[PDB]
Design an enzyme around this catalytic site. Structure first.
Site, short mmCIF file in Angstrom:
data_model
loop_
_atom_site.label_atom_id
_atom_site.label_comp_id
_atom_site.label_asym_id
_atom_site.label_seq_id
_atom_site.Cartn_x
_atom_site.Cartn_y
_atom_site.Cartn_z
N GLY H 29 0.79 -1.23 0.00
CA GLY H 29 0.00 0.00 0.00
C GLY H 29 0.82 1.28 0.00
CB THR H 30 -0.15 4.87 -0.48
OG1 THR H 30 -1.20 5.05 0.48
CG2 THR H 30 -0.76 4.57 -1.85
CB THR H 31 4.15 6.19 2.50
OG1 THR H 31 4.96 5.51 1.53
CG2 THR H 31 4.92 6.32 3.81
CB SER H 74 -0.52 1.69 4.57
OG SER H 74 -0.16 3.05 4.76
#
Ligand SMILES: [Cl-]
Lengths: 241, 235, 244, 240, 250, 195, 111, 243, 231
Positions: H29-31, H74
């Site tokens: 996932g994204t930060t 995330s």
């Protein structure tokens, strides 16, 4: 080979999921130790904060179950907190129903029975934890009772849990072979904590700072955990003799 | 094993796709919609000559204005018909009117995907639902076990379906009469049937606004079969 | 999920057999032989206890012959624990019938009820079947003396003489050879013990390896008496018939 | 509750549990149904592997559902009891609410509906039973004979057989049964039913059961001697 | 969630074996030896207190348990399974008997109830059998003294004397030579201690042996006076000292 | 409904039941048969609250007919009466009890004896030589106490029954429009068409 | 004791013409001898050229109208935007009312 | 083998492989980060702009629980939403019974026990999210991070997602260089920088910055989104530091 | 592979294959386009027929006077989800006298789809949805995936060959967003967008399906000769 996935008997009469839950117990790589004084029961446990981003005050495997009962856990924290919340609920319910504070050994038995159920019922997994309950019981006095994923439990004069439990166990065994008594003959709990820390140092062969340990003390009518400064005072006394 | 409601890597429900194979093994059913009515015809396919063929009920009345033909595991259709009849009658009770053919079909198709681990598997039968209402006139629907229903000008289901559908492709036009449709169903049934078509191993039916849904007598169908033979011999 | 571990106890084989029923019957074929013989003036139940010990308390022991009511009894072959579950249910059914109609339950009705329960475990629920086969010995005023058997499939049949458990093939041949319709209880007692004596896997047939019972109209006037034989009484009938 | 889908489709569009239930029927003892002009006869095979049987008390193969309808079967015996019980309950329920006994077609449709329900319900297996249901509708003299099978499909038959070696006796019935002129009397109908079983049975002793159902709740089961007379007459004509 | 294991985990194999029951019996075989001997005026049950650690207080772990005032139990196999069975056995003695008839159940019927619970774990959905074999000694007015064995299958058998667990085969042979129908309780206790010494490796004393009897009524252990018909429990657990006294006359 | 009588003679049981059905102020019917055949040799008459009476009788009838088919056997009158009693004893502690009183007249073919059972809506069963429900007994039991002999013929039973009905027609305020009489004996059940 | 019903007064009037219909109603809302509102609409346009008024206990009246308006909305969703005829609306309202047969909407409904 | 095919099964190691596979979804996932400041907390998240068609500032990721707790996560976004919905139920019932808003440590265990429950059975899947959350209560500011296993601890700074290693290194510098502490307005600026620095692991697509904060002085102990000028000020500070 | 038997099983790389297979069903479905301005929001859907005798499967469903969607994938699953939206829109109106926000409608769909991805026995929804609506904050367009992911967009397209229409909208972004107070031009842009996804077949009178909602425009669907204007 699905007899290794759920809690049913293998051809040898073994429960592999129970045995593997015992192995999860040492995943944290922490050693705990419990000893009894005259008026108290002391439990110490290694504290390891590997990340600098962690709030070290929230990193704990010792729990205040009731006013009188304390519990240290050897195993992963999610299962530890699961067991802690249940033990708190059970202790509170017991007091409501029966009109007196749940004894340490009775709570241990209750949690042991719950663990036994997970070894017999397939849909429930065992918890990968060993629960060491401590108190100063109003009838039995200083008490150490330990529960494991098999549903086994027993009372102890002293005990140790973790990867290096055997080294600590033998160290404690040898001391009680000398003294020939079932406890630490000491008036103040402060000195019983000092004994506990001293013998863990001797057994493990490692020195401790104030942030390397975690201490819980049970006295009559209350259980409490020591702060870093209370432990520091304890470490200073050990070093000065 | 594997879930009953499992998706394949292509994005299809295994069980729904397998029930479609069972429908391919079923006896042929053909429906043709015209502006004078909708015709429904089926292959009876008796397994033995001792089986009394008039007891084979593969064309069924849902209401006075809605009929239904089936193909596949025909035993599965009985609860679908019961639901359809109940839905049709219940709506009349609640609204003092006939129910729309599409709305009836939608109610039947709602049952289709109610399977899991509700019933244990999809239906193994496809339905041709034919009827008439004041809003959309004469209609023919094809209700599948996927829960999907398509409206059709003409449709064939069962073992001889793709051969029959190709034949319906050429023959159907928007100006067909009811008589022309009747003969057309008989013609295509005769083509795809294993045994020789007669009034005992094939059944006709129609739905008109005036007379409603009617299953044809064996004497009435026998005449249409004789009329068919003569017009094919005429060129 | 859980599906992975499901044995599916209630399914057909490709041949149209119920796996678990067939395997339960295989289990029962290793159980101690039980024999029932129906006569004109009564019924005999004889059964062999499985490899016993000298330290087993026989006089208080019961693993084969059980009482369902005053008129009906059963001989068990298979898992004893499974049998006791069904026996307690049967005892309750008989009492329900008695309370409802104020008459003792006809033998077949009781047998059908238990057999229906067994059947249920083979068709629905996903549980293992009862690894038990019964011989029902009973009396009612409609059909008189009756012998039935039921097995894990829930199928039951009536008999003049029948065996269940181990060596039934050999036992049934011996019964078929010496059985006659005008036979009496005392003769049937002898036939039962002689059959067991020949089909037994043990070296010799003794009193401590047997359970024995009779249902007789040999009760003072028009009524029926059940007799579960005591160890000493089994020892006497073994001497009388000339086996020991 | 146990919800496992046991009856499910396979890649080739077959429900194996329903098909394996038919194999249980194939194993079952042979049953035959023949309808005459004013009667229906149900013939049933009794396998002679089981002697020392008590024929008084042993469950008979033909069961009365009501006073005017009977049911025979081929397949699992224990399974058949469940269908018979349900059918008998429904017959009394129909009389109670409609104030008229069931038609033979209605009773068949019910039993067939139960069998179908067990092919798409969770946690249950299909019935390993095919039935022959015969009788006369109330105040009607037309004979009725229906067949059901595990899948739940049912249909009417001039004559039909089910169970082991049913392929052979169906072969016999197909060449010997004339639709334009069915067995005009009880004698002719019973004779044709016994003849059809003699193609498969073995000995004509206690291996053949016959039950005659006539209009207006007139149902009777023939005895050993009565059947034995048919067996005797058939073979004496055959010696030619 | 929900317990979705509504199907049996114990099933018949092609050979007719119930695997999980056999494996449960194998677990019992590995268990520590326990035994029971019936005398004319009493019953004795005994086992070894196999302490898992010398730091553990083995007095807190009771292998021999009171079920009713006249019935006691001992086991071989999995301790936790035994512990929950004792809880259920104690409760069922009240719910299915004492609260109905106003008296404690006779040995055979309490045994029957325990057996039933163990049978159900062998057939019910989503459970394994209990991995223990029980020995239940007891007394009641109409049956007198009795001793029963209960296996993982739920089967139970009455014994004059027997042994279960580790060295049961040898111990049963030892009991066959010594047992007779004229034994007094003290003679049975003596034989019990002799038999149990053979299967024990290490220390053999009152602190490593657990032994209880079903014998005479103990009015001193009743707790109250004033009711003549109440005469006290027949179950009595022997003390560490009482065992050692009899080990000198061994 | 109103009057139902029963009397057991030497070789038969005779049940007499009124023909009137009155709701409120009007007599809606004067030919109502307040009885159901439970089995070939068992008859049950009934009286109580409207609707409940017939609903209960037909429910019992169905249950006994189901038993007969299942076992190919006729239950004894005693067995049927015990089944009926239990249903009423169950019913009295229900949300809405069956308000029905019954007489069960049966001929036991095994014992070759007629049997009459009187059961009220509470589930109170008694076997009697003669019985009644409601206010009928208040007039008729004195006559039956006097005239009944247990060795009586069916014809004598009918004559004694006529004397009961005559007394009822004289002293009861309600016009119950005569009675339908039915006899239960070894040959089954039959109706006396002239009474 | 709690009385779940009340009387909000008012009066309504429906008259059917040859090619038109009117549904009238006063706008006064009351309890006992007090006026709640001098203008509280009582007759509502429910869509599909149907007007409705449920006079009596206003809470039940508002509840019924609200549920019928809802029924019109779902009739469109379920039956391809078909117009709900006045006879069909009438039958639908019968079921809404009889649905609470044993705890009735205390209103006199006119459409 | 086969120990990784079912949830709640211990491998011979004593591990639950299904939970470890859930972690892989989190790492994909994204930060997202969390910073504990002097009198509150600051949350920030990387939102990948998959396309120009995405409406700016509309697809909000950070979620509020009650009025004083912020949650960001995330991994699988729906799993995070499910967890927050539960958190909101837990917080509501706590306030219903006890009147006071749920304390942050108390709230942390509610999520912890719920997530841990999804490692107890094979009939459920573990959560595919690591959740960073916290806020201000009567005892002051608290920051937590909660893993798929149900494991959670208190944090001075926290980071998860694809750029967690980069972020963690940045957080560790702040802890060392500010032992006395960090202000709320400073933490917002630093949060913006860290997300921009952590974006190097997701450098293919451009992103949108989203920040929120609870602070006793700046927001009265209530959760609020950083908007307008204060957001632009943080973006400018962040852009200046990467260049 | 070994981890695609059910929705309750992560793969070793942290993937949910049953969800991904459900996503695959959308790609097989017929193309549909969504786009909006500041005043109006438009749905354009290419309907698919079984053969020449059959009707063209309907792609657009109305949820409320101010909201509706177009579908791609399993149509029965769209019926279930659209029915749920209808109920939620309706609950909002009846209880709060409030038109349901398009963003909140997306949140409700996300949470409903999510429960089917974490539980044993069930299955993910096999359909993708494009929700348009006009609420108190103007025109909106959402894209629903049965993984649970819902995304607010200016324009988008789902189904087979949807990448062509999506690229076109990505170029035209600055133009069509400005089409305010002109419904016909916004539809034209949508019809031109969906045309970039066509191969072999072209937009006919019974092939094309269009829907629109806006400031003073209730959600209305156009089919048949009503869309001949735009062909
Ligand atoms: Cl407990």
């Amino acid at each position: 080979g699905y007899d290794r996935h759920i809690t049913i008997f293998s051809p040898e009469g073994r429960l592999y999921q129970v045995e593997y839950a015992f192995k999860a117990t040492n995943q944290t790589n922490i050693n705990s130790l419990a000893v009894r004084g005259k008026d108290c029961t002391v439990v110490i446990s290694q504290k390891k904060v590997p990340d600098k981003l962690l709030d070290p005050t929230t990193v704990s495997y010792i729990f205040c179950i009731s006013r009188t009962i304390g519990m240290v856990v050897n195993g992963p924290i999610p299962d530890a907190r699961n067991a802690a919340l249940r033990a708190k609920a059970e202790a509170a319910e017991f007091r409501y129903k029966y009109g007196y504070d749940m004894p340490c050994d009775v709570l241990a038995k209750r949690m042991a029975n719950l663990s036994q159920i997970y070894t017999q019922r397939a849909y429930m997994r065992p918890l990968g934890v060993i629960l060491t309950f401590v108190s100063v019981d109003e009838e039995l006095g200083p008490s150490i009772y330990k529960t494991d994923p098999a549903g086994y439990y027993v009372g102890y004069k002293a005990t140790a849990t973790g990867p290096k439990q055997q080294e600590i166990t033998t160290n404690l065994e040898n001391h009680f072979k000398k003294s020939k008594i079932d406890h630490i003959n000491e008036e103040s709990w402060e000195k019983v904590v000092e004994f506990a820390i001293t013998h863990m140092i001797d057994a493990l062969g490692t020195e401790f700072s104030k942030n390397d340990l975690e201490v819980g003390v049970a006295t009559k009518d209350k259980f409490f955990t020591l702060s870093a400064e209370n432990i520091e005072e304890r470490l200073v006394a050990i070093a000065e003799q | 094993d594997r879930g009953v409601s499992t998706f394949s890597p292509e994005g299809r429900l295994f069980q729904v796709e397998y029930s479609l194979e069972a429908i391919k093994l079923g006896s042929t059913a053909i429906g043709i919609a015209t502006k004078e009515g909708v015709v429904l015809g089926v292959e009876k396919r008796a397994t033995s000559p001792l089986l009394e063929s008039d007891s084979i009920e593969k064309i069924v009345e849902i209401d006075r204005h809605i009929g239904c033909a089936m193909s596949g595991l025909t035993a599965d259709a009985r609860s679908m018909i019961e639901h359809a009849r109940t839905a049709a009658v219940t709506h009349n009770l609640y609204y003092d009117e006939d129910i729309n053919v599409e709305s009836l079909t939608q109610s039947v198709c709602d049952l289709a995907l109610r399977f899991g681990e509700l019933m244990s598997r999809p239906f193994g039968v496809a339905l041709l639902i034919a009827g008439h209402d004041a809003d959309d006139g004469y209609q023919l629907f094809h209700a599948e076990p996927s829960g999907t229903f398509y409206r059709y000008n003409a449709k064939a289901i069962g073992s001889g379906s793709e051969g029959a559908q190709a034949e319906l492709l050429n023959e159907w036009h928007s100006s067909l009469t009811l008589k022309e449709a009747e003969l057309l169903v008989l013609k295509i049934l005769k083509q795809v049937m294993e045994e020789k078509l007669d009034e005992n191993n094939a059944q006709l039916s129609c739905i008109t606004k005036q007379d409603g849904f009617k299953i044809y007598d064996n004497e009435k169908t026998a005449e249409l079969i004789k009329e068919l033979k003569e017009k094919e011999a005429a060129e | 999920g859980s599906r992975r571990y499901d044995s599916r106890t209630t399914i057909f084989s490709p041949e149209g057999r119920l796996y678990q029923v067939e395997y339960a019957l295989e289990s029962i074929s290793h159980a101690g032989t039980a024999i029932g013989i129906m006569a004109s003036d009564g019924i005999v139940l004889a059964a062999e206890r499985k490899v016993t010990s000298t330290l087993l308390e026989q006089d208080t022991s019961t693993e084969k012959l059980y009482k369902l009511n005053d008129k009906i009894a059963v001989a068990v072959a298979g898992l004893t624990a499974d049998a006791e579950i069904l026996i307690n249910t049967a005892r309750i059914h008989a009492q329900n019938y008695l309370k409802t109609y104020n008459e003792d339950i006809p033998v077949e009705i009781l047998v059908r009820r238990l057999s229906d329960i067994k059947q249920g475990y083979t068709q629905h629920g996903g549980l293992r079947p009862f690894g038990v086969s019964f011989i029902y010995a009973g009396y009612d005023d409609r059909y008189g003396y009756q012998l039935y058997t039921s097995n894990p499939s829930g199928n039951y049949t009536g008999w003049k003489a029948i065996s269940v458990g181990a060596n039934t093939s050999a036992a049934q041949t011996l019964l078929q050879m010496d059985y006659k319709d005008d036979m009496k209880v005392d003769d049937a007692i002898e036939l039962a013990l002689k059959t067991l004596s020949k089909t037994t896997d043990s070296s010799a047939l003794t009193y401590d390896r047997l359970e024995f019972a009779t249902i007789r109209k040999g009760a003072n006037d028009g009524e029926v008496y059940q007799k579960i034989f005591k160890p000493q009484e089994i020892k006497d009938i073994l001497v009388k018939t000339g086996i020991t | 509750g146990y919800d496992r889908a046991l009856s499910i489709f396979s890649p080739d569009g077959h429900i194996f549990q329903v098909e394996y239930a038919l194999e249980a029927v194939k194993r079952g003892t042979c049953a035959v149904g023949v309808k005459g002009k004013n009667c229906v006869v149900l013939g049933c095979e009794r396998r002679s592997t089981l002697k020392l049987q008590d024929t008084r008390i042993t469950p008979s193969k033909v069961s009365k559902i009501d006073s005017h309808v009977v049911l025979s079967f081929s397949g699992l015996n224990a399974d058949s009891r469940i269908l018979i019980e349900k059918a008998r309950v429904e017959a009394q329920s129909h009389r109670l609410t409609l104030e008229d006994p069931v038609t033979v077609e209605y009773l068949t449709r019910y039993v067939a509906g139960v069998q179908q329900r067990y092919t798409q319900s969770g946690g249950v297996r299909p019935f390993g039973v095919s039935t022959l249901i015969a009788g006369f509708d109330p105040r009607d003299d037309e004979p009725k004979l229906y067949q059901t099978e595990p899948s739940g499909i049912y249909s009417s038959w001039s004559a039909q057989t089910i169970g082991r070696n049913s392929k052979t006796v169906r072969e016999f019935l197909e060449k010997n049964y004339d639709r334009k002129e069915p067995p005009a009397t009880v004698e002719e109908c019973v004779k044709l039913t016994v003849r059809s079983l003699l193609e498969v049975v073995q000995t004509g002793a206690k291996n053949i059961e016959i039950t005659v159902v006539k209009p207006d709740s007139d149902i009777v089961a023939l005895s050993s001697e009565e059947i034995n007379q048919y067996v005797t007459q058939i073979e004496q004509e055959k010696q030619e | 969630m929900t317990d979705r294991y509504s199907f049996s985990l114990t099933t018949f194999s092609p050979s007719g074996k119930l695997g999980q029951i056999d494996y449960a019996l194998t677990a019992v075989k590995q268990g520590v030896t326990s035994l029971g001997i019936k005398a004319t005026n009493g019953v004795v049950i005994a086992t070894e207190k196999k302490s898992s650690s010398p730091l553990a207080m083995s007095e807190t772990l009771s292998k021999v348990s009171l079920l009713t005032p006249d019935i006691g139990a001992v086991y071989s196999g999995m301790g936790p399974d035994y512990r929950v069975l004792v809880d259920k056995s104690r409760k069922v003695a009240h719910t299915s008997y004492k609260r109905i008839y106003g008296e404690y159940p006779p040995t055979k019927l309490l045994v029957s109830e325990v057996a039933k619970i163990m049978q159900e774990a062998t057939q019910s959905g989503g459970v394994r059998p209990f991995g223990v074999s029980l020995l239940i000694a007891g007394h009641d007015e109409f049956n007198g003294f009795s001793l029963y064995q209960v296996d993982p299958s739920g089967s139970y058998f009455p014994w004059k004397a027997t042994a279960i667990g580790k060295g049961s085969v040898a111990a049963k042979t030892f009991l066959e030579k010594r047992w007779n129908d004229e034994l007094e309780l003290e003679d049975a206790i003596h034989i019990a201690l002799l038999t149990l010494k053979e299967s024990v490796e290490g220390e053999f004393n009152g602190d490593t042996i657990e032994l209880a009897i079903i014998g005479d009524e103990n009015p001193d252990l009743l707790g109250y006076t004033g009711i003549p018909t109440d005469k006290g429990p027949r179950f009595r657990k022997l003390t560490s000292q009482e065992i050692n006294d009899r080990l000198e006359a061994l | 409904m109103d009057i139902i009588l029963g009397i057991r003679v030497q070789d038969s049981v005779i049940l007499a039941s009124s023909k009137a059905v009155t709701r409120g102020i009007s007599v809606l019917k004067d030919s109502d048969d307040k009885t159901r055949q439970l089995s070939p040799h068992t008859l049950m008459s009934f009286a109580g609250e409207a609707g409940d009476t017939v609903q209960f009788a037909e429910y019992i009838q169905a249950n006994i007919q189901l038993y007969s088919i299942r076992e190919d056997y006729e239950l004894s009158p005693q067995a049927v009466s015990s089944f009926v009693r239990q249903e009423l004893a169950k019913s009295i502690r229900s949300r809405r009890p069956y308000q029905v009183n019954v007489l069960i007249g049966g001929y036991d073919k095994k014992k070759n004896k007629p049997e009459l059972y009187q059961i009220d809506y509470l589930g109170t069963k008694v076997e009697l030589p003669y019985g009644a429900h409601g206010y009928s007994g208040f007039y008729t039991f004195s006559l039956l106490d006097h005239h009944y002999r247990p060795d009586m013929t069916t014809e004598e039973g009918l004559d004694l029954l006529k004397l009961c009905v005559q007394e009822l027609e004289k002293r009861m305020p309600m016009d119950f429009k005569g009675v339908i009489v039915k006899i239960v004996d070894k040959d089954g059940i039959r109706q006396v068409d002239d009474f | 004791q709690f009385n779940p019903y009340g009387d909000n007064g008012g009066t309504i009037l429906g008259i059917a013409g040859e090619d038109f219909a009117v549904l009238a109603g006063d706008t006064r809302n009351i309890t006992d001898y007090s006026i709640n509102s001098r203008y509280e609409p009582k007759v509502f346009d429910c869509g599909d050229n149907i007007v409705m008024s449920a006079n009596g206990f206003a809470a039940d009246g508002d509840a019924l109208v609200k549920r019928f308006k809802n029924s019109v909305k779902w009739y469109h969703f379920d039956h391809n935007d078909k117009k709900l005829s006045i006879n069909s609306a009438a039958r639908n309202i019968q079921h809404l009312l009889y649905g609470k047969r044993f705890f009735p909407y205390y209103v006199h409904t006119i459409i | 083998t086969g120990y990784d095919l079912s949830n709640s099964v211990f491998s011979p190691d004593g591990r639950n492989f299904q939970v470890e596979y859930a972690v892989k979804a989190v790492e994909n996932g994204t930060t997202s980060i969390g910073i504990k400041c002097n009198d509150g907390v600051v949350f920030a998240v990387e939102k990948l702009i998959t396309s120009k068609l995405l409406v700016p500032q509309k697809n909000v990721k950070i979620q509020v629980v009650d009025r004083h707790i912020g949650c960001v996560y995330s991994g699988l976004i729906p799993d995070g939403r499910h967890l927050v919905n539960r958190g909101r139920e837990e917080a509501a019932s706590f306030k219903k019974l006890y009147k006071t808003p749920i304390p942050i440590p108390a709230f942390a265990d509610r999520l912890g026990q719920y997530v841990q429950a999804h490692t107890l059975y094979n009939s459920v899947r573990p959560f595919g999210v690591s959740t960073i959350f916290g806020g201000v209560d009567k005892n002051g500011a608290h920051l937590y991070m909660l893993e798929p296993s149900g494991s959670y601890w208190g944090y001075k700074g926290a980071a998860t997602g694809k750029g967690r290693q980069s972020a963690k290194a940045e957080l560790e510098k702040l802890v060392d260089h500010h032992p006395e502490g960090l202000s709320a307005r400073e933490a917002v600026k630093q949060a913006a920088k860290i997300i921009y620095l952590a974006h190097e692991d997701n450098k293919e697509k451009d992103f949108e910055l989203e920040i929120s904060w609870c602070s006793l002085s700046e927001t009265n102990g209530l959760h609020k989104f950083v908007k307008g000028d204060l957001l632009q000020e943080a973006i400018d500070f962040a852009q200046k530091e990467i260049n | 592979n070994n981890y695609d038997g059910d929705t309750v099983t992560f793969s070793p790389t942290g993937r949910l294959f049953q969800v991904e297979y459900a996503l695959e069903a959308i790609k097989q479905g017929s193309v549909t386009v969504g786009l909006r301005s500041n005043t109006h929001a438009v749905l354009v859907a290419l309907k698919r027929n079984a053969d020449e005798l059959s009707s063209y499967q309907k792609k657009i469903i109305k949820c409320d006077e101010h909201m509706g969607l177009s579908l791609a994938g399993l149509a029965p699953d769209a019926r279930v989800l659209s029915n749920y939206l209808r109920q939620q829109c309706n609950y909002s109106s009846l209880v709060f006298n409030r038109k349901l926000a398009v963003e909140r409608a997306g949140h409700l769909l996300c949470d409903k789809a999510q429960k089917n991805t974490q539980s044993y026995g069930g299955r993910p929804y096999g359909v993708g949805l494009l929700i348009i609506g006009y609420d108190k904050s103007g025109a909106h367009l959402l894209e629903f995936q049965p993984s649970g992911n819902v995304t607010e967009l200016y324009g988008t397209a789902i189904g087979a060959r949807s990448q062509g229409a999506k690229t076109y909208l990505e170029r035209t972004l600055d133009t069509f967003i400005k089409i305010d107070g002109n419904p016909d031009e916004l539809i034209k842009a949508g019809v031109e967008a969906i045309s970039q996804s066509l191969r072999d077949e072209s937009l006919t009178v019974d092939n094309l399906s269009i829907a629109i909602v806006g400031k003073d425009t209730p959600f209305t669907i156009y089919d048949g000769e009503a869309v001949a204007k735009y062909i």
